[PDB]
C-alpha cells in the first residue's frame, strides 16, 4: 500500500534524473528540470497515497466523498503544475472551444425551444432516435419517459435542426388492417367491400372530413383474397383507440361471414 | 429546502478560498479572485433559492411561469458574470457562428423554396426521411401531416439540396400486380395474356399514352405459374385508384378462370 | 388577438429595461440599449399584429398573399435591425459561403452536364438514389418521372461525381431465368440443355455477337434440379422485351416436357 | 404570357423602391440602389420573356436550342450583374476551388491510371460499387457495360485509391458446390469422397498447381449429409466454364449414385 | 541474433553514405549529415540489440519489464534524435492538440457528469452502444458490467452529449404480451377482454395512476385471433417482475379457457 | 465530321464576341479578351478535329495510340492556355495537395509495411474489405488473389492503420460443429459427451496445449437435443484440415449411434 | 526487355522536347528544362532496366532482395530529383503531418495503455471490431488471437478512446436459457418454477451474491409454454462453464418431466 506508493515514483524519478545527467553530457537547463521532476514525482506520490487512503476509508456522506476526492485529485494535479511553473502550451483555446460548444450549444437550443415551442410537458414526442413522453423540460437537458417507462436524458442540442413528431397534437388518427379471405367465387367481393365501407360511415368515432374510409382488394391467390381496410378515427384517448380498433375488426368480420365467406390463412 | 440551498455553496466557497490561501503560499491576484468567488457563490445560492421557490409555487398563467423563470435563471447567471467582470474568453465567435448557421440557414432555405417552388399547400411530398401532406409553409419550419396523421415539424434547411418527390403533381399513375396460377398445360398461357391486355386497353381510366399495358409470365414451377400485370391509370383521386385496382384484379381473375384455369398457391 | 399581441412584447420590454436598470447599478451604455429595446419590442409587436391580420384575411390571389407577407415579415425584421443600428457580427461571410456553395454548385453542375452530356430528354437514368425518365433538364434542377410516375425534383449538384446508369443507350439486353425440374434420372440433363441452347440460337431477336446463350445446371436435390438459362436479346422496346421473355420461357418448357420430364417445385 | 412577365417584376420593383424610400427616412446610397434595382428588374423581366418565347418556339436543331438559351440565360444574368456594377463578394475562390477539385481530380486520376495501368479495354472489372466491361477509357470518364448491358459512366476520380478487382487477368478459376445426400449409413462417406477427388484429378480442364481438389463432409442430419466439392479450373472462356461446372456436377452425382446412395432434400 | 543486428544497419548506413557521396557530386551539408547518419545507425543497432536481449530474458517482475523496456525504447529513440540535433519540424502542436483533446475531453466530461449527475454507483444504464450496471465511476473512465457480466471500460467523453437511459430510476414498469386464440365465434371476444381488464385492476402490484390496463384485439384470421394485453406494474425488483409477468399470463389464460375458448397457433 | 467540328466553335465564338461588344457598351479589356476567345475557339476546334481523326483511324500499336492522343489532348489544352496567357487562379496548391496526399501516402505506407512487416509473399491475409493471397508486393499497390482467384489491386495506404488478420501464421486451428440428436431419455447425454471428449484426446492431429476439447449440450426440445463439439487441431495444410473435420464428425456420429441414439432433425 | 526499356522513355523525351521547342515559339527557361527532361528520362530508363534485371534474377536471401531493390528504386528516384534540382513544392509539411500522426499516435496510445492498463498478456478482450486473446503487447502494435486462432495485428491507436470489454477479469458469469413446454394445464406452472429455483440455489457453482436465480414464463401458445431460466455462476474455467450449463439444463428437464409435463416444439 504505502510501500509501492512511495517506491515506484521515487525509482522512476531517480531513473529520470540519471537519464538527464547523461543527457547533459551531449540544452543546459539542468536545475529547473530536476526541480520540476522532483515536485512532479512528489505529486505523483501524493496522488497514489490519496487514492490509497480513500479506498481505505471506503473499506469501512458517500457521494460527497467521491466528488470531494475527485476535485481534490484535479486540484492536487493543478497545484503540482503551478509548482512546476515556479521553477501553457496552447491547450486552453482548444478546451474552451470544446466546452463553449457543448455548454452554450445546449443552452442555445434550450432557449430556442422555449421561444418556438415544438412540444409541452406531457406530450409524446419522437425526435430521431428518442421517443416517449416529456416529463421534465430543463435548461440543458430534457427528460423523456420511453416505451418501457425508463427515464431518458436527452441534451437540448439534439433538438436543434431535427424533425420532431408530436403525437399528442393530432386531431384525428389513421387506422388500417388487412383481412385474409378463403373465398373461391370473387363475385361477392365488391358487395362485401361496399358493405364494409357503409359500416365505416354509419359508425360514430370516425372522421369523414378528409379521407373516405376504404376497403379494397390488395392481392389474390388460390382460395385466398386479402382486403385492406382503413379509416380515420376522431381524436380520442389510448383506450378508446384500442376498443375502436377491435370493434371495427369484429364488425368487418361479421359482415364478411354474413355473406357466407370464411376467413383465409396466411 | 432553504437549509441546503444556503449550506452547500457557502461551504464550497469557504473550501475554495481556503484552497486559494495555500495557493498564495507558493499569481498574486488574491483579492479579485476572492471577490469573484464570493459573488459567484452568491449567485449559485440565489439560483438554488429561485428554483426552490418556483417548485414551491408549482406545488400549488403556467407557460409564462416557465419561460419567465428560465429567462430569469439565464439573466441571473449573466448578471453574476457581469458582477465578476467588475472586480470574454472567445466563446462569442463560436456561438454566433452556430446561431448564424442554424437561423440563417433556415431562413435562406425558406426563401429559396419560395422562389423556385418545389410544392404548395396541400401537396403530398416525400423529402428523404419525411413524408406526408403539407399543412403549413412557414418562415423557418414547414409542417407536414404524416401517414398516421401526426403533425411533423421539419426545418426548412432539410429541403436545401435533397430530392423532393411530389406525389400530387402526377398526371398518370402506374399500377402492377402478380397473379399466381395453378395450371399444368401452359399452352393456354399466351392467349390468356393477350386477353388480359385487351381487357386493359378497352377499359377506360387507363392511359395508353406512353406505355402499353403488359401481362407476362415471370416464373414457373410445378402446377404453378405467375403473371405480372401492369398498366398506367389516368389522373384520379385516391378512392377511384383503389376501386380501379380492385376492378382490374377482378376482371383479370374472371378472364383467367374463364379459360378453365384455377388460381395457384404461394 | 390584438390584446396579447400588444401585451406580451410590452411586458417583456418593461421587464427587460427593469433588469437593465439594476444592471446599471453594478457598461454605461444605457440610452442606446433602451432605445434599441424599445424599437425591437415595437417590431415584435408589429410582427405579431401582421401575422394576426393575415390570418384574419385567410379566414375569409392566394400564393401572392403568402409570398408577400413572408417577404414583408423579413423586410420588417430587416428595417427593425436597421433602426437598431441607428441608435454586423460576422454572419455575412457564413451565409454568403453557404448560398454561394448551394447556388453556384447547382449552376456549375448544370453547365458541366451540358458540356459532357451523360443523358438527354426522355432517357431512363439511375443516379444513386434516384431513378426514372428525364422529363425536364433545367438550369438548377432536373426533373425525373420515377417508377410510380411521380415527378421527382433533383438538384444538378447530385450528378457531379456520381455514377449514372443510362438504361436508354443500351444496344442489347441480357435476360436470364431459372427453371426447376422434377427429374430422377439426370442422364437426360445434357441433351435438354443442348436443345435449349439450339432454341436460343435459331431464334431471332437474340444477339449472338458477344456471349453465347447458356443453359446449365446450377443445383441438384432429391427429385429436383435447376436450370439457369440466359441470353442477350437485340435492342427492342419494352413490350417486345416482355413478349420475348415469355416466348423464350414457354419454348424452354416445351423442350423440357418434350423429353418426358415434368417441372419441379421449390 | 407577356402580361405577367411584365407585371410581376415591375410591381416587385416599385414595392422595393417604395420600401427603400422609407428606408431612407431613418445609409445614404439612394440613387445607385434604385438604378441597380431598375436594371435588375429589367433583367428579370427579360429572363421571363426569354423563357416564354423559347417555350413558345418549343410548341411548334433541338439540342442546340437548349444549350443556346441556357448559355443565353446565364449570359443575360451576367450582363445584368455587370450593369449593376456600373452604377465580387468572395464567391470566386470558392467556385474555382470546387471546379478545380472536380475537373483536375478527374484529369489527374485519368493520367495516373494511364501510367500504372489497373485495366485495359475489354476487361471486366469491379471497383467498389461499379462492375462490368470496360468499353471506353476516356480523359475524364470511363465507360463500363454492367451486368444488364447498360452503359455506365464513371468519373476517373472514383478509381483513385480504391480496390480494383480485374476479372479478366485471372489464370485459373475456383469453383465449388454443395451436394445433399440421403444416406443413413455414413461408412460409405470416405470412399465416395476419395472417388470424387479422383474424378477431379484425372479430369482435364482442372488446375492442380496450387490447391488439391477437395470433397469433404460439412454437416450431418437425419437421413441427410452434405458434401462440399471444389477445385481450380484452368483459364477458359465463359462457356467452357459453365459446361465444366455442369460436367463436374453430373460426374459427382454419377459417382454418388453408383454407390447406391440417393440424393437428399433441403 | 547479434549478427544481423549489427549487420543490417551498418550495411544500410554505408549504402546511405555511398549514395550521399554521389549526391554531393551534383546542398553542401556533407559532414553533419554523415554524423547524423552515423549516430542514427548506431541507435538503430542499439534498438535491435535491446529487443534481442529482452526477448532473450523473456526466454528464461514481469509487467515492470515490459513497461521498462518500452519507455527505454522511446527514450533511446529520443536520445538518438537529440544527438542528431547536436550535429522540431512542427509535429509538436499536432500531438499536443491530439493529447489535449483526448485527455482534457475525458476529464471535462468526468467533471460535468459529477456536477449534473445522470447516474450513480449501481444504476443500470444504457448510453448509446454500451449498457449495463455502473460498478466504478472514475476520473477518466467509467466501468460498467454488461449483460454477460463482463467489465466494460467506457471513456467519460462518450457521455458528453448522448442520451442516457437510466433503468434504475423508474417508478413503474410497462409490461405487455400477445395471446393467440383459436376461436371461431368472435361474439365472446368483448366479454373476455372486459374480464381480463378486471383481472388487471383488482390485482395488486399494478399501477393505475396513469394508464388503464388494456386488452384489445389486434388481428384476426381463420380460426385465429390475437389479444394484446398490457399494464403498468409498480416499482419492484427483478424477481417480482418475472413472477408478476408469469402470474398475469396464467390468469389471462385461465380467463380465456374459462369461456370455453382454446388457444391458437402461429 | 469536319463540318460540325468547324461549325459549332466558330458560331459559339462569334456569339461570344457579339455578346462582348454590347458588354463593352455599358471593364475596358476588349482586345485581349477577343484574342483569347479566338485562340480558345481555335483550340476547341483542334480538339474536336483531333478526336475525329483518331476515331477515324480506330475505324481501320493500339494502347500507344490511346495514351498518345490522351497526352496530346491534355498538351493541346495546355498550349491553348499558355497562348491565352500571352495576350494561375490558385488551383495549383489544391492539385499538388491532392497528388501529394495520394502518391506520397501510398509510398509512405509501402515503406512502413516494408519495415514492420505485417505479411509476406504467399500469405493469406484479410485487411478490412479485402481478403486473399498476396501475389505481388509492390511500391504503390499490393496485389491479392481473392476467394474466386481474381487478381485484386489494393493501394498500400489501405494498410496504414487497419487491422490485418494473417491466416498463414497460425500455429493451431480451432474447429467446431453442432450435432442434432433425436433422443428422448437424456440420461445417456453425459456419458456420450465424455466418450466424445475421449475421442478428441486420444486422436492425433489435435492440440491439447491451451484448450481442452469440449462437447456440451447447448439446447433441448421435444425428441431433440444439440451437442456442440470443438477442439484445436495442430498446424496443417488445407487438405488435412478438411479430412480431419470429416474424420472427427464421423467418429462423433459413430460414438453417438453406438449408444443406440439416432440423429435428430432441424 | 532492354529494347522497350530504352525505347519508350527516349521517344517520350524527344516528343517532350519537340513540344517544348514550339512552346518556346510563343517562359524562356529552355536549357534547364531540357537538362531536367534529359536526366529524368535517364532515371526512368534506369528504373525500367532495374526492375527488368531484378525480375530476371527472380527467374533463377529472398526478402533482402525485395527490400533492397525497393529502397534502391526510391533512392534512384530521389537522386534523379536531386539531379533535377542541380539544373520543394510544399509536400513536406503534409507528409510529415501524416507520418507524425500515424507513428506518434501509435506510440502515444502504446504508452497510455502502459500507464492505465486496460488488459494484460493472456486476457481475452473485445475492442470494437476486434476480439480475442492478447498474445503480444508491442510498442506500436498489439497482437491478438481471434476466435479461429488466427493472429490479428491491431495498431495501438485503435485503443485510444474506445470501450474495451475484458472477459478475463469477470468474477461471476451470467447464464440463461429457454425451455419450451407442451403443457395444456398451466396450473402446474408455478410449482415447477419454484422447484427449478430451488434447484438453482441448493446447487454449488452458482453465485447468490447479487441476483437471485430466476425461472419465469415468458410466452404462451396452444399446447405450448416457454420458461426463461437464468442464474449467476461463480468464477470458473471454460470447461466447467460448459459442464455447468449442461448440468443445469439436464436438472431443469428432470424437474419438468418429473411433474408429468413433456417438452414442447418450436
Ligand atoms: C467545466 C466543465 C465543462 C466542460 C465540458 C465540456 C466537455 C468538452 C469535452 C468534450 C469534447 C472534447
Ligand atoms: C438565440 C438563440 C438562437 C441560437 C440557437 C442556435 C443554436 C446553436 C447551437 C447548436 C449547435 C452548436
Ligand atoms: C438567396 C437565397 C439563397 C441562399 C440559399 C442558400 C442556403 C444556404 C443555407 C443552407 C446551409 C446552411
Ligand atoms: C465550368 C464548369 C465546371 C465546374 C464544375 C464544378 C462543380 C462544382 C460544384 C460542385 C460542388 C460544390
Ligand atoms: C501526376 C498524377 C498524379 C496525381 C494524382 C492525384 C490525384 C488527385 C486527385 C484526386 C482527388 C482530388
Ligand atoms: C517513414 C514512414 C512513415 C510514414 C508513414 C505514414 C503514412 C502516412 C500516409 C498515410 C496517410 C496519408
Ligand atoms: C502521454 C501520453 C498521452 C497521450 C496520448 C494521446 C494520444 C493521442 C494520439 C491519438 C490520436 C492521434
Numbering used by the authors:
A (entry chain E), B (entry chain F), C (entry chain G), D (entry chain A), E (entry chain D), F (entry chain B), ...: 204 to 229, 236 to 269, 276 to 302, 313 to 491
Publication passage describing the model:
MSL1, predicted to contain five transmembrane helices and localized to the inner membranes of mitochondria, is involved in the regulation of membrane potential and maintenance of redox homeostasis under abiotic stress. When heterologously expressed in giant E. coli spheroplasts, MSL1 displays stretch-activated gating in excised patches and channel properties similar to those of E. coli MscS (EcMscS), which demonstrates that MSL1 forms a functional mechanosensitive channel. The overall architecture and domain organization of the heptameric AtMSL1 channel resemble those of the EcMscS channel. Akin to TM3 in EcMscS, the innermost helix TM5 is kinked such that TM5a lines the pore and TM5b runs tangentially to the central pore axis and connects to the middle and C-terminal domains, which are located in the mitochondrial matrix.
Electrophysiological analyses of EcMscS, AtMSL1, and AtMSL1 A320V expressed in giant E. coli spheroplasts indicated that AtMSL1 A320V exhibits much longer open dwell times (that is, the amount of time spent in the open or partially open states) upon tension release than AtMSL1 when gating is triggered by a brief application of negative pressure. We determined the cryo-EM structure of the AtMSL1 A320V mutant in detergents to an overall resolution of ~3.0 Å. The bowl-shaped transmembrane region observed in the wild-type channel flattens, which is accompanied by considerable in-plane expansion. In the structure of A320V in detergents, the diameter of the transmembrane domain is increased from 90 to 105 Å while the height of the channel is reduced from 116 to 92 Å, compared with those in the wild-type structure. These drastic global conformational changes in the transmembrane domain result in substantial opening of the central pore, which increases in diameter from ~8 Å in the wild type to ~20 Å in A320V. The pore-lining helix TM5a becomes more tilted within the membrane and joins TM5b without an apparent kink. Concomitantly, the outward movement of the straightened TM5 helix results in wide opening of the hydrophobic gate, which renders the conduction path less hydrophobic at this region.
